[PDB]
Ligand binder design. Structure first.
Ligand code: G6P
Ligand code: MG
Length: 564
C-alpha cells in the first residue's frame, strides 16, 4: 500500500466551478452528489502547474475541519500524486488555519496551497464546502490564475488519480508512495497543525511579556471563542499551553465538523455566547474567530464591543508595543474604502501613508509585496499585517494582548483614550439582504447620477443639531500602484467636509438577488459626544443616507436585515 497505480478517469465537465476571491464554495451535497465535482476541480488547479515544475513542487494542504474535508484531502493527494506533484505538506488531521497555510507556504517556499474551508459559512452534511487555492507568495490565487482554473474546469475530459493511495492524516512524519512506472516517490509530510504558525508568532510577539500578562495572581482574564472552528487548537497550544492562560480561557476550541451547528462567524449575534459571558464582568478581554481563522471580534470588560474599524486604529496607534514592528518599522497602513476613517486619523498624526483600497485582499497583498504595507484592516472583522499574505484573527488578539500588557489599562479605557486623542469615528454597517436586483441596481444608478450633478458638491443635509456638507461624491475607483489594474464601480461615497462619510455598495458575494451594504461613518470631536451610543449618534447620517438614496422606495425595506 505504499506502491500504487496511476489511472486515467474519464470525467464530464461542470460549467460553474468558478473560484472567486475566496475560492470555490458549494453546498456539501453538491460535492457529494455531483460525480467527480471535486476531482475535476482539483485536477484543474494542478493543471495550472507546468509539468516540468511539478516534481520539485510542494503544495500545502489543510482546512478548517468541516464535514467532507478529510475525504477532499485524500482526493487531493490521490490526484496530486498521479499528476507528478512531488510533495504535499498537510496539517495533522487535515487541520490548518488559513493563516497557518499562508505561513507554511512562505516558510518552506511551496508553490502554493489548497485550503479546505468555506470560512464563516456553516458546515456539516447540510452546509457548505469550500476549496481555496493560494499561490507561492502564500496569498490567494489572483484572478488571472482562477480564470485559467475555471477555463480548464469547463472543458476537462479526464483526470489522473492514484485510486489506491491513502494518506494517514493522524500521524506526524513523512509518508512516501512509490508510483507504478514513476522513478521518484510521492511524499506526504504530516506536520503539527500549530507548530510553524506558533514559531512565527514567537518571533513577532513577546511571549515572555504575554505569559506574564496571562499568568498568576493579577493575570489578565480572557475568554477566547474559536466557535468550534480551526483556531481551537491554536488557542489551546499557544494561549493556554505556552502562555499560561488557564484552560477555561479557551471556549469552543475543539474543531467540530458542523461547527457545533452554528455559523463560525464572529459578530454580536453569532458569538452571542461569548458576549453574554463577557457581560458578567468577570473577564477583561474576549475574542471570537471565524471558521478558518482570518477574522476576529474583540470584546472588553462587560461586553464592550471594539468595532473592527477602531480595532485596527488602536493597534496602529500602539503598534510599537509589538516587537515585530519595533524591528521592521511601519511601512504603511491600509483599510478597505468602506472601513471607517479611524485609521486615517492615526496615520495622519504619525505621518505614515494610508492606503484606501477596494474591498478585497489582493490590494493589501500587492502593497505588502512592495514593502509598503505593515498593518491593514477591514470593517468586516479583518485585521492583518505583512507577516503573511492572509488576514490573521489570532494574530490580532496577540496584538491586543501586547497593547494591553504595555498600556496597563482596560480595553474600554484604551478606546476612550483613543477617541479623546483622535476624535471618534462612530461606525455601523447596514446590510439589506436579498433585495430584488432591479430595485437595488436602480437605487444605485439613480444615486450615482444624483451625485455626479454639478450642484451636488456643496449641498447641505441637516438632521438634528448636525449639518453635513458634501465635500466630494463619487463612484470609488482605484488605480493599483503595483499591478496597474484599474478597479471601477467600487462603491458610492458621500464625503462630508466634517470627516464623515456615507458609502453604498452592492455585495459581490451574490446570494440570490442583491444585498445592499450601507456604511455610515460619522466623525465626532466633541468630548461630550464621543461616549454616546453609536446608533444614536449615527441616526442623523442614517436619515440622510436613506433620504438621498430613496432606499425604502426602491427596495420596500424599512429596516436593514443586519446592523453591525
Ligand atoms: O462583496 P461583499 O459581499 O461586500 O464581501 C466582501 C467580503 O467577502 C469575504 O467575506 C471576505 O472574507 C471579506 O474580506 C470581504 O470583505
Ligand atoms: Mg475567514
Amino acid at each position: 500500500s505504499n506502491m500504487v497505480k496511476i489511472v486515467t478517469v474519464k470525467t464530464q465537465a461542470y460549467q460553474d466551478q468558478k473560484p472567486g476571491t475566496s475560492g470555490l464554495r458549494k453546498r456539501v451535497k453538491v460535492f457529494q452528489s455531483s460525480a467527480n465535482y471535486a476531482e475535476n476541480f482539483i485536477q484543474s488547479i494542478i493543471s495550472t502547474v507546468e509539468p516540468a515544475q511539478r516534481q520539485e513542487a510542494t503544495l500545502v494542504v489543510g482546512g478548517d475541519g468541516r464535514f467532507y474535508m478529510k475525504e477532499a484531502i485524500q482526493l487531493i493527494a490521490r490526484i496530486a500524486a498521479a499528476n507528478g506533484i512531488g510533495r504535499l505538506v498537510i496539517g495533522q488531521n487535515g487541520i490548518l488555519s488559513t493563516p497557518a497555510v499562508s505561513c507554511i507556504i512562505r516558510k518552506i517556499k511551496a508553490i502554493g496551497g489548497i485550503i479546505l474551508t468555506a470560512s464563516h459559512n456553516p458546515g456539516g452534511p447540510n452546509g457548505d464546502f469550500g476549496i481555496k487555492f493560494n499561490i507561492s507568495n502564500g496569498g490567494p490565487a489572483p484572478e488571472a490564475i482562477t480564470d485559467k482554473i475555471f477555463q480548464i474546469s469547463k472543458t476537462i475530459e479526464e483526470y489522473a488519480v492514484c485510486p489506491d493511495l491513502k494518506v494517514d492524516l493522524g500521524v506526524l512524519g513523512k509518508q512516501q508512495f512509490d508510483l507504478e512506472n514513476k522513478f521518484k516517490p510521492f511524499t506526504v509530510e504530516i506536520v503539527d497543525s500549530v507548530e510553524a504558525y506558533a514559531t512565527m508568532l514567537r518571533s513577532i510577539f513577546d511571549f515572555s511579556a504575554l505569559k506574564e500578562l496571562l499568568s498568576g495572581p493579577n493575570r489578565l482574564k480572557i475568554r477566547i471563542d474559536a466557535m468550534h472552528g480551526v483556531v481551537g487548537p491554536y488557542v489551546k497550544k499557544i494561549l493556554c499551553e505556552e502562555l499560561g492562560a488557564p484552560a477555561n480561557s479557551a471556549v469552543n476550541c475543539v474543531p467540530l465538523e458542523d461547527f457545533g451547528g452554528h455559523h463560525p462567524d464572529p459578530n454580536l449575534t453569532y458569538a452571542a455566547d461569548l458576549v453574554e459571558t463577557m457581560k458578567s464582568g468577570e473577564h477583561d478581554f474576549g475574542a471570537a474567530f471565524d471558521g478558518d481563522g482570518d477574522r476576529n471580534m474583540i470584546l472588553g470588560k462587560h461586553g464592550f464591543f471594539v468595532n473592527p474599524s477602531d480595532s485596527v486604529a488602536v493597534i496602529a496607534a500602539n503598534i510599537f508595543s509589538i516587537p515585530y514592528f519595533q524591528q521592521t518599522g511601519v511601512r504603511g497602513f491600509a483599510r478597505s474604502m468602506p472601513t471607517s476613517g479611524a485609521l486615517d486619523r492615526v496615520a495622519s498624526a504619525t505621518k505614515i501613508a494610508l492606503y484606501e483600497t477596494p474591498t478585497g485582499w489582493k490590494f493589501f497583498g500587492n502593497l505588502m509585496d512592495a514593502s509598503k504595507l505593515s498593518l491593514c484592516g477591514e470593517e468586516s472583522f479583518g485585521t492583518g499585517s505583512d507577516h503573511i499574505r492572509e488576514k490573521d484573527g489570532l494574530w490580532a488578539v496577540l496584538a491586543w494582548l501586547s497593547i494591553l500588557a504595555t498600556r496597563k489599562q482596560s480595553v474600554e479605557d484604551i478606546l476612550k483614550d483613543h477617541w479623546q486623542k483622535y476624535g471618534r469615528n462612530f461606525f455601523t454597517r447596514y446590510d439589506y439582504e436579498e433585495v430584488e436586483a432591479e430595485g437595488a441596481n436602480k437605487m444605485m444608478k439613480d444615486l450615482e447620477a444624483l451625485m455626479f450633478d454639478r450642484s451636488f458638491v456643496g449641498k447641505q443635509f441637516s438632521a438634528n443639531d448636525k449639518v453635513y456638507t458634501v465635500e466630494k461624491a463619487d463612484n470609488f475607483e482605484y488605480s493599483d500602484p503595483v499591478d496597474g489594474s484599474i478597479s471601477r464601480n467600487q462603491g458610492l461615497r458621500l464625503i462630508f467636509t466634517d470627516g464623515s462619510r456615507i458609502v453604498f455598495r452592492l455585495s459581490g458575494t451574490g446570494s440570490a438577488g442583491a444585498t445592499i451594504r450601507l456604511y455610515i461613518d460619522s466623525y465626532e470631536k466633541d468630548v461630550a459626544k464621543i461616549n454616546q451610543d453609536p446608533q444614536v449618534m449615527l441616526a442623523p447620517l442614517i436619515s440622510i443616507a436613506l433620504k438621498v438614496s430613496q432606499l425604502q422606495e426602491r427596495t420596500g425595506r424599512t429596516a436593514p436585515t443586519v446592523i453591525t
